[PDB]
Amino acid sequence: QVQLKQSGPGLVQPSQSLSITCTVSGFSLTNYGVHWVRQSPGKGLEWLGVIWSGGNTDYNTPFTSRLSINKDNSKSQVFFKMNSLQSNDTAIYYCARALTYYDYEFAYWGQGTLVTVSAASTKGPSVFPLAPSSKTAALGCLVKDYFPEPVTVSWNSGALTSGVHTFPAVLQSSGLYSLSSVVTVPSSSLGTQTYICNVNHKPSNTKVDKRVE
Amino acid sequence: DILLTQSPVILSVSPGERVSFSCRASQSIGTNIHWYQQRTNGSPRLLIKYASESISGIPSRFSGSGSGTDFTLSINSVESEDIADYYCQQNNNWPTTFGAGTKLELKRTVAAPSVFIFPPSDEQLKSGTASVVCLLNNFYPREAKVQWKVDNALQSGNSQESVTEQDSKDSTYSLSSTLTLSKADYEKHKVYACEVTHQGLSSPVTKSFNR
Amino acid sequence: EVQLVESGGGLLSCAASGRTFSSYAMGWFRQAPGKEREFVVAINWSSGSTYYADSVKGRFTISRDNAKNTMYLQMNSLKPEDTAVYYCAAGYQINSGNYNFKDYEYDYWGQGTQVT
Amino acid sequence: KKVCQGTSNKLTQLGTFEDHFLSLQRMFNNCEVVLGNLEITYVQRNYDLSFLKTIQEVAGYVLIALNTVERIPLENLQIIRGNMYYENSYALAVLSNYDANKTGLKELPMRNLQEILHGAVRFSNNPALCHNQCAAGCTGPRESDCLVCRKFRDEATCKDTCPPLMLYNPTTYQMDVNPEGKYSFGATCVKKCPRNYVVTDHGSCVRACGADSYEMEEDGVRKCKKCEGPCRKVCNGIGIGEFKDSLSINATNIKHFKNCTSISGDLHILPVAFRGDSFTHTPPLDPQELDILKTVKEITGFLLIQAWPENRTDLHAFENLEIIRGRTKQHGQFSLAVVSLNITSLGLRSLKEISDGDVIISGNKNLCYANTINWKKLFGTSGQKTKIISNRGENSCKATGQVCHALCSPEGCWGPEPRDCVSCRNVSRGRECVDKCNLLEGEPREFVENSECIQCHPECLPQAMNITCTGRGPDNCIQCAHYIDGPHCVKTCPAGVMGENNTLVWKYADAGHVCHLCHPNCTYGCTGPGLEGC
Ligand SMILES: *[C@@H]1O[C@H](CO)[C@@H](O[C@@H]2O[C@H](CO)[C@@H](O)[C@H](O)[C@H]2NC(C)=O)[C@H](O)[C@H]1NC(C)=O
Ligand SMILES: *[C@@H]1O[C@H](CO)[C@@H](O[C@@H]2O[C@H](CO)[C@@H](O)[C@H](O)[C@H]2NC(C)=O)[C@H](O)[C@H]1NC(C)=O
Ligand SMILES: *[C@@H]1O[C@H](CO)[C@@H](O)[C@H](O)[C@H]1NC(C)=O
Ligand SMILES: *[C@@H]1O[C@H](CO)[C@@H](O)[C@H](O)[C@H]1NC(C)=O
Ligand SMILES: *[C@@H]1O[C@H](CO)[C@@H](O)[C@H](O)[C@H]1NC(C)=O
Ligand SMILES: *[C@@H]1O[C@H](CO)[C@@H](O)[C@H](O)[C@H]1NC(C)=O
């Protein structure tokens, strides 16, 4: 199985620099290059550059001056580095591999790293239960006042997926994000099954489990 | 440089229909075109390589045709699972570049929302704030009206909505509306109501609770 | 593209079509059941110079029909000590020959004509 | 007469004083004539050099140095030709024949050494010391009646030169193969080269053809044909032999590819070569040393270029590469791969075949052309496919006028120059496409032979407002620019060349510049008809 797994902080202050590590598995960096591609919510998918197998690089024109990709074939990982970021550099950054040597049919993609460019401070969420009333029932969690994105939410630690709706974050007037995850469940379950929402917010390193009764 | 133009921008389609995504290239590039699928919160997924060559794991209903400037990605019978953005990619001129995508929406029968309303947790109220959430679960079409009411007083500019993406299985939508009062304002009132208007409802549904 | 059509053997012709065999050199190899494949004859195309193997020397005769693009071989006065499978080969040469034939290179091979 | 090769070791000592003598005997044992040099060195005391009595002649030089032996019996040495010199201009050099043991050379009885044919003599530090074409002495007034010849010999006869291979036929104005002609083996005229010897491109019989020449066969006799350009030198490729655990062509291994023409394997050029690899104690490669590969015309395996001089516009070092057989392939796939280079044109103008394997040209952001080639023409094996991806767009390339030249055929180009065309639109001169051949104007005048201009013979006279020749030969002329020997335009009439009956034929110039036969009586030359010539 071929995998690109990437790790890196996704909050970078203006004029400061972004760093992402793409850790490779299923193939060698000595036989294949690794490409970098970003995706802004407006300006679509954009190819940043490559580190070829021989260690030589190639950067897209608007990134020559501020991009450096290196790697370590032994540790089997790749290091993306881009400098003096600004607001327009806010996007999701991906590492990718092509299906075939020397080519660009990107069949294998990293999970992506959500880079947010802001001077604002990181802030963990508060978690509040949405308890099911007395009247199929619905229940959920309120994930409020966090920054930056993203926050990941699961139910019963993965065991509960059907009927779940984790809503897209909304920007509050405070400039903090707020989000709500809900699930529908047979009313005949409340006093039968315990329901727990697992909220995780990497940038603040806040992991929270709140039971909903 | 070279331009990949994708049309249409959004494409709504009933299940079973035929679908054609167009990607026209400003220069002639033979068959140096790839296609990708990208579902919500997911990474792009290679569908077709070099205009028509199929990729393993991708279902048979996807196919690609064309050469030179005009390229096509085809679905012979659309299913709800196929909801996503679709991008084309050119391999010919340096540097490789992507189209701006086509969004595939899906049509379906009208479906009225299940409405639920949640009060503020007592934990939250301790912190001096009170959020009140109204939920509209699994409905179609997307257009829906939500009125918050506190003791029969229409609220304005103290609520925020969020709509989920179209579901992969039933192709419905879901919506959360969130009213925020101060603890003080919240405690200075009794009735809290969410009035939902939708095409699948004969009369506006209301769900409520008394503090 | 480069096709070598073998036809003529059993209890010998090599029709070579596909490209300009100007600087080429075609010949014949043989392989015995229980041994390696071995040289037998070879012939430069331009000029029509020729090179035989020792055991093949005299007892054989190779020729070239230009324009028709074909390379014939005579197996007159054969013996049980020469029974094997025969492939006709072809290869581009760096300078239309002009170096020792034992160091010629062959890239395209025929299918396999039997000789018992 | 017995013949030994000789030696050219100089003052070098071959092993122990015993090993040196033991190897001196084996060479010069029973030898009568020395083709090379006679080198006697480091001979110890009480060592019998009595086998040197058989030596009758030496062609090269003779050296006698650092000898402590008492006697060196060269009692039969009759001649020293001096084909070579030892140092400066000494054909015979006898130097420092002594030791710190008080025992040097006493007796050097060269009683028969009458003549030294060429070169002076040098003696120092030796404290204990007739016909017309003959040389040494004469046992008669004739040439056969001589001890040793001056120039050559031919069965007793002492000639000044060996009988030519061919003789001018005054009838058909052509040449004929002389049945009295013989090769020049040493100072002898033999009708056939000896066992395990080879004919020169002209005359002699040598064991080794040497450089600038290879060994071909003609009329059952192995000869030495000159190498059209560099001689063929096969060499090992990356991964094999010298480069077993080699990753790329680096500053270390690059030297060994000198004068190589054919690579038995693969060829890798990777960025590590330009960076250097400490982990292998390999320094950076200076790009200029890639020129070494210009001599490469063929590669049995594949060609992989992942790094290249950024200031270099094309694959210059492979401007003479003719074929890639692709017998071995990258990942079992590619025979040619060019990835992420700065180049503008590939520049493989000599490439004519890629027998197998796929081609991948990818990521060369400045690379133009490349898509103009029809690679099908180069492929020999079916299923071969090319991938030309993410290089410079054709349209960008148009905007700067980097397109195949107007003289190129539609088959495409390896670059912008007329010498980069795959094939020509009209005609080629050298490796260059052109508009027309110089038929009725221009220097030189030429003629067409299959889409190619060919220089008329330089003895054809340029005709204003018409052609000047029809074939490569001087017989194909229209008007002879100088003289005429029948159907042959010439720059000088035949005067001095040998012919039938062993008679030197002479010709003079008719005022119409036509070569005619002199009178037989005139044997040393003639400047007109009749006896009055000489
Ligand atoms: C450059 O070439 C040299 C010689 O071909 C390589 O040096 C060899 O390295 C192997 C593995 O370390 C050793 O076993 C040999 O003893 C070395 N030979 C010599 C002559 O030094 C070297 O590895 C090559 N470097 C690269 C980057 O390919
Ligand atoms: C890499 O190659 C490119 C194209 O060959 C070179 O670009 C040209 O460089 C020359 C240098 O004399 C300039 O005169 C031209 O103006 C450049 N072409 C342009 C700007 O279109 C580039 O120089 C090479 N890179 C290096 C480091 O040598
Ligand atoms: C935003 O990006 C643009 C290029 O798209 C560039 O001018 C700069 O990086 C940013 N703009 C500023 C700093 O005004
Ligand atoms: C390369 O060829 C030249 C040709 O004159 C020769 O002089 C030189 O010795 C050769 N170098 C080698 C074999 O390393
Ligand atoms: C390439 O750059 C080097 C830099 O040292 C320079 O010496 C050389 O002349 C350049 N090559 C050219 C101009 O062809
Ligand atoms: C060269 O060939 C082209 C193609 O037919 C032709 O148009 C042109 O006149 C030719 N030029 C000559 C023969 O000088």
Side-chain angles (χ1 to χ4, degrees), chain D residues 15 17 19-21 23 25 27-28 31 33-38:
Chain D
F17 292 78
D19 290 331
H20 188 311
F21 168 91
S23 59
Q25 71 170 24
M27 166 52 55
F28 298 84
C31 186
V33 189
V34 179
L35 302 175
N37 313 307
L38 176 59

Coordinates of all heavy atoms in Angstrom, one line a residue, chain D residues 15-38, unseen atoms left out:
Chain D
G15 N 63.4 -7.5 -13.8 CA 63.6 -8.4 -12.6 C 65.0 -8.4 -12.1 O 65.8 -7.5 -12.3
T16 N 65.3 -9.5 -11.4 CA 66.7 -9.7 -10.9 C 67.7 -9.7 -12.1 O 67.3 -10.0 -13.2 CB 66.8 -11.0 -10.1
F17 N 69.0 -9.5 -11.8 CA 70.0 -9.6 -12.8 C 69.9 -11.0 -13.5 O 70.3 -11.1 -14.7 CB 71.4 -9.4 -12.2 CG 71.6 -8.0 -11.7 CD1 71.0 -7.6 -10.5 CD2 72.3 -7.1 -12.4 CE1 71.2 -6.3 -10.0 CE2 72.5 -5.8 -11.9 CZ 72.0 -5.4 -10.7
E18 N 69.4 -12.0 -12.8 CA 69.2 -13.3 -13.4 C 67.9 -13.3 -14.2 O 67.9 -13.9 -15.3 CB 69.2 -14.4 -12.3
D19 N 66.9 -12.7 -13.7 CA 65.6 -12.6 -14.5 C 65.8 -11.8 -15.7 O 65.2 -12.1 -16.8 CB 64.5 -12.0 -13.6 CG 64.1 -12.9 -12.5 OD1 64.1 -14.1 -12.6 OD2 63.6 -12.3 -11.4
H20 N 66.7 -10.8 -15.7 CA 66.9 -9.9 -16.8 C 67.6 -10.7 -18.0 O 67.3 -10.6 -19.1 CB 67.7 -8.7 -16.4 CG 67.8 -7.7 -17.5 ND1 68.2 -8.0 -18.8 CD2 67.6 -6.3 -17.5 CE1 68.2 -6.9 -19.5 NE2 67.9 -5.9 -18.8
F21 N 68.6 -11.5 -17.6 CA 69.4 -12.3 -18.5 C 68.5 -13.4 -19.1 O 68.5 -13.8 -20.3 CB 70.6 -12.9 -17.9 CG 71.3 -13.9 -18.7 CD1 72.3 -13.6 -19.7 CD2 71.0 -15.2 -18.6 CE1 72.9 -14.5 -20.4 CE2 71.6 -16.2 -19.3 CZ 72.6 -15.9 -20.3
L22 N 67.7 -14.0 -18.2 CA 66.9 -15.2 -18.5 C 65.8 -14.8 -19.6 O 65.3 -15.6 -20.3 CB 66.2 -15.7 -17.3
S23 N 65.5 -13.5 -19.6 CA 64.5 -13.0 -20.6 C 65.2 -12.4 -21.8 O 64.5 -12.2 -22.9 CB 63.6 -11.9 -19.9 OG 64.4 -10.8 -19.4
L24 N 66.5 -12.1 -21.7 CA 67.2 -11.6 -22.8 C 67.6 -12.8 -23.8 O 67.7 -12.6 -25.0 CB 68.5 -10.9 -22.3
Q25 N 67.8 -13.9 -23.2 CA 68.2 -15.1 -24.0 C 67.0 -15.6 -24.8 O 67.1 -15.9 -26.0 CB 68.7 -16.2 -23.1 CG 67.7 -16.9 -22.2 CD 68.2 -18.1 -21.5 OE1 69.4 -18.3 -21.3 NE2 67.2 -19.0 -21.1
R26 N 65.8 -15.7 -24.1 CA 64.7 -16.3 -24.7 C 64.2 -15.5 -26.0 O 63.7 -16.1 -26.9 CB 63.5 -16.3 -23.7
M27 N 64.5 -14.2 -25.9 CA 64.1 -13.3 -27.1 C 65.2 -13.5 -28.2 O 64.9 -13.7 -29.3 CB 64.0 -11.9 -26.6 CG 64.0 -10.8 -27.8 SD 62.8 -11.2 -29.1 CE 61.3 -11.3 -28.2
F28 N 66.4 -13.3 -27.8 CA 67.5 -13.2 -28.8 C 68.3 -14.6 -29.0 O 69.3 -14.6 -29.5 CB 68.6 -12.2 -28.3 CG 68.0 -10.8 -28.3 CD1 67.3 -10.3 -27.2 CD2 68.2 -9.9 -29.4 CE1 66.8 -9.0 -27.2 CE2 67.7 -8.7 -29.4 CZ 67.0 -8.2 -28.2
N29 N 67.6 -15.7 -28.5 CA 68.2 -17.0 -28.7 C 68.1 -17.4 -30.2 O 67.0 -17.4 -30.8 CB 67.5 -18.0 -27.9
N30 N 69.3 -17.7 -30.8 CA 69.3 -18.2 -32.2 C 68.9 -17.2 -33.2 O 68.7 -17.5 -34.4 CB 68.5 -19.5 -32.3
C31 N 68.6 -15.9 -32.8 CA 68.2 -14.9 -33.7 C 69.4 -14.4 -34.6 O 70.5 -14.4 -34.1 CB 67.7 -13.7 -32.9 SG 66.9 -12.4 -33.9
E32 N 69.1 -14.1 -35.8 CA 70.1 -13.7 -36.8 C 69.8 -12.3 -37.2 O 70.8 -11.5 -37.6 CB 70.1 -14.6 -38.0
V33 N 68.5 -11.9 -37.2 CA 68.2 -10.5 -37.6 C 67.2 -9.9 -36.6 O 66.2 -10.5 -36.2 CB 67.5 -10.5 -39.0 CG1 67.3 -9.0 -39.5 CG2 68.3 -11.3 -40.0
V34 N 67.5 -8.7 -36.1 CA 66.7 -8.0 -35.1 C 65.9 -6.9 -35.8 O 66.4 -5.9 -36.2 CB 67.6 -7.3 -34.1 CG1 66.8 -6.6 -33.0 CG2 68.5 -8.4 -33.4
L35 N 64.6 -7.1 -35.8 CA 63.6 -6.2 -36.4 C 63.6 -4.9 -35.6 O 63.4 -3.8 -36.2 CB 62.2 -6.8 -36.5 CG 62.1 -8.1 -37.3 CD1 60.7 -8.7 -37.2 CD2 62.6 -7.9 -38.7
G36 N 63.7 -5.0 -34.3 CA 63.7 -3.8 -33.4 C 65.1 -3.4 -33.0 O 66.0 -3.3 -33.8
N37 N 65.2 -3.1 -31.7 CA 66.5 -2.7 -31.1 C 67.1 -3.9 -30.4 O 66.5 -4.7 -29.7 CB 66.3 -1.5 -30.2 CG 65.5 -0.4 -30.8 OD1 65.8 0.0 -31.9 ND2 64.5 0.0 -30.1
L38 N 68.5 -4.0 -30.4 CA 69.2 -4.9 -29.6 C 69.6 -4.2 -28.3 O 70.5 -3.4 -28.3 CB 70.5 -5.4 -30.4 CG 71.4 -6.3 -29.6 CD1 70.7 -7.6 -29.1 CD2 72.6 -6.7 -30.4

